[PDB]
Ligand binder design. Sequence first.
Ligand SMILES: *C(=O)[C@H]1N[C@](C)(CO)[C@](C)([C@H](Cc2ccccc2)NC(=O)[C@H](Cc2c[nH]c3ccccc23)NC(=O)[C@H](Cc2c[nH]c3ccccc23)NC(=O)CCCCC)O[C@@H]1C
Ligand SMILES: *C(=O)[C@H]1N[C@](C)(CO)[C@](C)([C@H](Cc2ccccc2)NC(=O)[C@H](Cc2c[nH]c3ccccc23)NC(=O)[C@H](Cc2c[nH]c3ccccc23)NC(=O)CCCCC)O[C@@H]1C
Lengths: 229, 191, 191, 204, 204, 204, 212, 202, 208
Amino acid sequence: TIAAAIFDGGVVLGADTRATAGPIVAVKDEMKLHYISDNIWVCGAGIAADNDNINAVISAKLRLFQMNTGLQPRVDQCTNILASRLFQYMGYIQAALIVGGIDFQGPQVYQVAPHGSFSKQPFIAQGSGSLAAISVLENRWHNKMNEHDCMEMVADAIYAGITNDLGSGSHVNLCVIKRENPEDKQSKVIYTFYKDYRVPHENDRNFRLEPQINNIDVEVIKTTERPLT
Amino acid sequence: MLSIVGLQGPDWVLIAADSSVSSSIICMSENYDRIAQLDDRHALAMSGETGDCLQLSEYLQGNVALYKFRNGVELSSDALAHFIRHTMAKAVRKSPYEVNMLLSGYDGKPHLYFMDYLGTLQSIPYGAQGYCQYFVMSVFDKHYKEGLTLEDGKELMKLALNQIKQRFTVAPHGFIVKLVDKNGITKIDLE
Amino acid sequence: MLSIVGLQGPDWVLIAADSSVSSSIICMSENYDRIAQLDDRHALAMSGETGDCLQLSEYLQGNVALYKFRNGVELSSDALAHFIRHTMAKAVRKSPYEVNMLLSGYDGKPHLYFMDYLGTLQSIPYGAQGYCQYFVMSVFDKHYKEGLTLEDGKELMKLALNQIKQRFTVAPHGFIVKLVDKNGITKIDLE
Amino acid sequence: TTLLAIQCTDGVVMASDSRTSSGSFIPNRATNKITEIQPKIFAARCGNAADTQFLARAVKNYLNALNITRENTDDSTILVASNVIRSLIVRYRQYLSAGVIVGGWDSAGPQVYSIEVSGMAIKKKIASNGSGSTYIQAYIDQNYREDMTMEEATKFAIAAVTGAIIRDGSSGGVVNIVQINADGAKRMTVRPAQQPFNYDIVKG
Amino acid sequence: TTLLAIQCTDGVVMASDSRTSSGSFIPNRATNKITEIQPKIFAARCGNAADTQFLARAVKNYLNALNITRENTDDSTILVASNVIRSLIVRYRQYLSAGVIVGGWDSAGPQVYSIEVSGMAIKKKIASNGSGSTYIQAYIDQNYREDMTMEEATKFAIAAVTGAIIRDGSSGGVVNIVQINADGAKRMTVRPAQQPFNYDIVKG
Amino acid sequence: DISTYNGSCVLAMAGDHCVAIASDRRLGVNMLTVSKDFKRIFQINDRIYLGLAGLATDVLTVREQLRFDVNLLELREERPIDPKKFMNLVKSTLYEKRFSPFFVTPVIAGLLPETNEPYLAASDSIGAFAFPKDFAVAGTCEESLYGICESAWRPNMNPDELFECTAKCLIAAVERDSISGWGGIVYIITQDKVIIKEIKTRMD
Amino acid sequence: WSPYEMHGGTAIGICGDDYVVIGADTRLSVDYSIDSRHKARIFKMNSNCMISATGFDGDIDAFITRMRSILLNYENQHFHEMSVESVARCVSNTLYSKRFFPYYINILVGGINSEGKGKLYGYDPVGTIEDLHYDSNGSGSSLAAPLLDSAFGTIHHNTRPFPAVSLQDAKNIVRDAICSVTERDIYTGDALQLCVFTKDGFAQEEFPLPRH
Amino acid sequence: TTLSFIYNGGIVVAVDSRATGGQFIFSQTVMKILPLAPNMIGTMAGGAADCQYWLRNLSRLIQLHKFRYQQPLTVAAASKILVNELYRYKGYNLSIGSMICGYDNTGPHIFYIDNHGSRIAGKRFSVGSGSTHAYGVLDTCYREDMTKEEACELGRRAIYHATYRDSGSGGRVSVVHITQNGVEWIDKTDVFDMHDFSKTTF
Amino acid sequence: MQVITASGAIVAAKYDGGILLASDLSITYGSMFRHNNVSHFVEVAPNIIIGASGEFADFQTLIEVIKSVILQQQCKHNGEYLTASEVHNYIKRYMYQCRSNMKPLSCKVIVAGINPDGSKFLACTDPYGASWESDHIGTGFGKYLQGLQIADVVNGSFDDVKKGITEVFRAVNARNTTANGKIEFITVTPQGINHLAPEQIDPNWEVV
Ligand SMILES: *C(=O)[C@H]1N[C@](C)(CO)[C@](C)([C@H](Cc2ccccc2)NC(=O)[C@H](Cc2c[nH]c3ccccc23)NC(=O)[C@H](Cc2c[nH]c3ccccc23)NC(=O)CCCCC)O[C@@H]1C
Ligand SMILES: *C(=O)[C@H]1N[C@](C)(CO)[C@](C)([C@H](Cc2ccccc2)NC(=O)[C@H](Cc2c[nH]c3ccccc23)NC(=O)[C@H](Cc2c[nH]c3ccccc23)NC(=O)CCCCC)O[C@@H]1C
């Protein structure tokens, strides 16, 4: 479950932290919200390596763009590059991305489908828990909502996916792209990443047999030690 | 598709069969008798799934015995061959017996019948079911003389079986060869 | 999936291979050498399509010779094994060499390498490629003593090959067995 | 999807629904299916959003390429856009599953070109595409008039796209309207509350 | 195929095209797709002609069976016909690919029941089925009135089936109309010359 | 399947300033045990070890490509590759084959150069890397290792206790995985030495 | 069309000298969707045994209904409730009666025999019966099986006597294993129905599990 | 891996105990020898449910014949009953690889039966994924004039080597020694204990 | 499991006074909005209503079967109706028998009733005969587009459960292609089954 909505002064992206190796939770604290530029973040659903590499590649492209050109990467620019890259792979790179950022055109949230389709929407939810998240976003998102309301809404959407979707779980990470000065629309676009913005307590391991009963006796055939050099 | 060979002579039929039974790539046994003696006069070499050849052999032998007991007379080699063909044709229409057979018999005159799984009944002087028919036929063709002596017939059957052993990729570990003649069915060793 | 077996000893490697080459169900030849002597020190038993094993053997032998001529030194058994594995891994990524090999070698010390078609390189004391690995391993496991004499090793290889012949359904007509030791590669007859 | 481009006397009215459908899920219910190729060239997009968006991107690229070597940037731009979309749909016929109604205004006046998913480009005064357009075919036939102005064509296009929205699951949401005249393009959004009718016309 | 049964105040108007399609071939261009189950029970048939004709045959059989043990032959006959067609479509869901609009008049008045190919029987005042009905959905929505009389519903049904005929290749030929009131059923054939419009409404 | 062609079981584990990385020693061809001496764990550098679980082919291909890369990087930079930098190198190596993935899953167990902190990096076949602070699991015994380690792992395991769970928590997993096992080997990388203990697992 | 849903959820049985503890997650989920969060998959069958079922829930219910009817027939026609051994054999026979249209359900028959001993039987969908001392079924069976193997080392040394744990030690092993499976299995969670069959009979506890 | 061989001292039937679905070892304590009659056992290889259910049903049929008729049911008879019952389900995708071993009036008998309907009499059989390895041990180390201990060890070692070389074989070798005096359940020996960890070649 | 004419999402949730079910009154033929004002719920007993999401032909078959069984038991029990538990048990058995006969009913069936003991009974049988009793059940995109809106208020006040179901069905109308028309609400309370006026639950269209 990843999501991203636009509030009055910026964008709130959010993602669960579960990565699944099929039916098994491979990662319980996986990072799906990825910095693209100081003004653009991308949450990602789909194949974990696909999202990681597409986000790293477009982040590198826009970092080069900002270093050479000196220009703040645009959310539509990031989305166009992601959409073109995902389209040239014909959906093979399974990265359903949400690009949330701020540029001179304000705060923008785009979705980029794995096949290279893209769309600017006020709020987006993608991933296996996208429907549970998008219910929350549909019933909670409104124009010019404030930063905290959108934070709570996006966190509740990620949490809806966590609770309802088995492919989604663990914590809610958020990122809030805003401007350092809400009054000034030319003020620096900052991002605040809330790692573990929600850590659902009912999803914590309630029990643990601390004196682990173990009857497997380890027999060492051979022990060889070497200096760590 | 196991190797069964048949060689009808003037007054005998040498009926050989792959004596080795395998479970996939494992040779389970090396003396497996695939020539079901349906009667004291008829040996039916069978080539196919061991468990379908066994069931067909049991059914055919039981029906031959039932004919002999119910009717005091025994089935002729032609009559038994046509009964087997009737069984195989009924099956292939309903549930094919995946068993290709050589019915050797001696009802006073030697008989050898090619009997495919479908129900193809054909009296033959010699024949084979399995892939060995691709290897033995020419041998027989090149070396079968009319009026073979039983020893010349044994040499010819040994020739065909050695052709299988030497040239057939899936070469049987050995063959069980039975002589069907006026003395009944006797397991003869080709040496 | 032809039967190749290997048995590394204290100072030798007995490398056997199915000596019979077949075209489908026909045994075309019975003395076919599937153990390509890549070098005077290395015999690569090959199991697979005869025409892919031949091409891989020619490439590997030519590259070993090229290494020996270009560089005055010869490839080690480990180095040659890793070069073969590199070839097989490149192929499997591009166009797999459907050839499972046992690289026996003696570069001053006996070496036997399991080398699957994919590029699985593993030094082994004994091994097999084909279905014979299901039949010979236990034999070796049950009868391989550390420090085997070359004659005990020959008896053990004969044991494994007779296990293939007796229990493997697709039983090779025979095996070509080569001793790879300080004297090079010599076709030895297990009797 | 519902697309309806009407070449009127005084301009082009490109209407569409806003529903992107992923099965029975609407990943984008405010989809802008009429892409602005140029200020007065728009591409109503039907089919794979990736494919049709690539077509819009590539036709923008090809129209800029058309203008590399010329100064009459406003000449044959709708016709060239249609030709390029046709060439891309034919060239990527295996890959692209996309039909584009490229409508708008250029030096040649108001023009609508329907490039079907097959890659068949045809100049139309009334072009319709998408699964929703089917439901409104008879409606269009009985309510389209060649003499409709851009206002009349806009009202008709809103009504037709609303009918397709109501009857088509793949069509829904707002009616995205683009009115392209010589002076430029005006975008309008007819949200379900502002649409002439809703689900209640079904059996009544 | 186009089928359009309208339950009016004074009767039922079952319109259909007459085109049986075998691929792009019309084996029967004067197909009577509205089968007379009983003098005032008719089955507009969509789908496999064999399957729908078997459904009509079997519902005639089941309605006669319904009347074996009763004398109120005119009671619940449309409803029982719809129930039976539903039961046959569900029972032969694997085999039968058929949707039947059973409309007509019985003791309960004028009734139209659309039994979809799925086997979903629903009482409707306006039921439409077939590939051609799709093209007229919006048209029906914007031109059907619950207050239409059998004359008004007949004119509307002819117009709608004509639109479906024009736009649907699978729909064509004449409009077969059945007007069932308490007094019985009147069949009409609107040949293409008598139809309100023709192919020329397409883009104009 | 090719992922289970060579049964694998790799298990890295975090202790108190010490990592463990254990592997089953089996080289199996599907259900056949070829060897009990297969090396899946490779010293990348003094404080980085790589356990490659999966196709022995790809295990050696990726171990040797990573050795190529790390040797070149250490020659150019004249310093050992950092565990994080080697993790990124492994991710790059595995995603370079994104469309033809290696059938190997890496488990990087290292000590961070400065703080000697345990560094676990488990990834899928294409470099999607997790960085568990407790344990990394890979191979055909993946789920088994996940469960046993999730229950068994405790913070601040000293090299003795860390080896004890690596061995026990690997024995439990391999002895439930038919195609992996046949002995284990645990590399305990502590701040000053590496202890390679060959552990007795079941040989069936 | 597969007539199953392969729902998931994990069950873990541990027999003891005088007890059988089967803990099963109550999650009824499939295809990343949770149909129910509390669908008890352990059923008290009679005063001697309980049946834990994992797998397709329709098959679980059909099999449990059939086994309840079979046990009721047995209690009527024998005037004593079916023993855990007899119920275990009936479970094997019932699962095999659908051998070619299997109940895609894994069964644990955990009960107390006439000797007061805890008897646990593990099954596959087609009715293989293993008279075992601990077993795991369901989506997290692979996760939990090594956990029970460590707890008992029976897999490691299968000829050594089963190191039976206290009833509470078995309950804690099942709880910890279910918690681990829940942490790693997406189809296991929302609760742990921890049922214990002793001489006292059937005693059910519910423990919250992570619902993510 | 199951195996059964007749030698001069009787029948030695050694089976592993591993039930493995896919690559996961579901059990290591499953009983793959089923006693059918006082002097006759059946081994299990293939579908565990199929093998155990059908050996249980063969035991029921043998008991029915025993109570119905004074004539003892031979091992050949039990094998034929089982192979007819299995052929009744020919095409039903049963998976039974069994050895019906035991002593009857005619002495020792092993019949390899399978769901395919095969029924092969023999003095030496091995069924299951590790059958080839157990065969490698048996055909090589088998002697007709073995001792009871030597024969039990031969079966045990054949199963152990099959478990080592077969992923589908493992657990504990259950060794039974059938004689004219009945089925003797020699013992269950963990193949883990049988492995020689002094040796390094395997 | 073929769904041609589909009933859309159902969202049932227990509240203090009963079970509030909600569903559009639309049947969709494929993606087409085919029929309107078709209640996806059928009152089978005075305190037992049955809805279904999916093949509405299969829902009609099931409702005919349920009504025949209820009538049989009413004949047996002097007009006394089967309890919601009994009706759901029969639906579970029938749908599992249909999935085992390989002719499954392609409809997730909700049984919402008040048992004679006054206990709210909300259960659901999926097309495969897998059944479960919950305090709230979503079928179709009423399950997926659900989040915590129902779980957080289930068994709460009628207004809270109505608000949560309205949130879920706003999500359904926004994001379900087959969602058409007003969402009818039905309260199954110990005082009977009340069909509340259908509501047009509008997605927030300021998003554009
Ligand atoms: C809500 O809906 C969330 N759902 C889950 C499944 C995220 O946990 C996704 C969709 C998530 C996206 C994501 C993005 C960035 C990092 C992690 C995760 N998807 C996954 O985690 C995927 C699921 C998956 C697998 N295959 C496909 C195909 C299409 C779509 C989705 C998927 N999981 C993975 O990619 C696996 C990660 C993995 C497996 N073992 C690991 C060990 C250590 C570290 C990571 C491991 N990898 C694979 O399955 C291998 C793929 C090989 C392809 C050739 O996120 C949203 C928010
Ligand atoms: C020789 O080397 C040994 N090989 C193995 C594989 C024994 O483990 C066999 C052949 C053995 C026979 C056997 C006999 C009696 C008891 C146990 C085992 N086979 C198995 O163990 C099989 C392997 C298997 C998997 N799928 C098929 C299909 C056809 C034939 C064989 C197989 N395993 C099983 O049958 C499973 C046993 C079992 C016990 N508890 C379980 C819990 C959960 C899952 C499985 C369990 N059962 C199933 O796979 C049932 C699947 C039903 C799906 C609807 O023995 C010789 C000696």
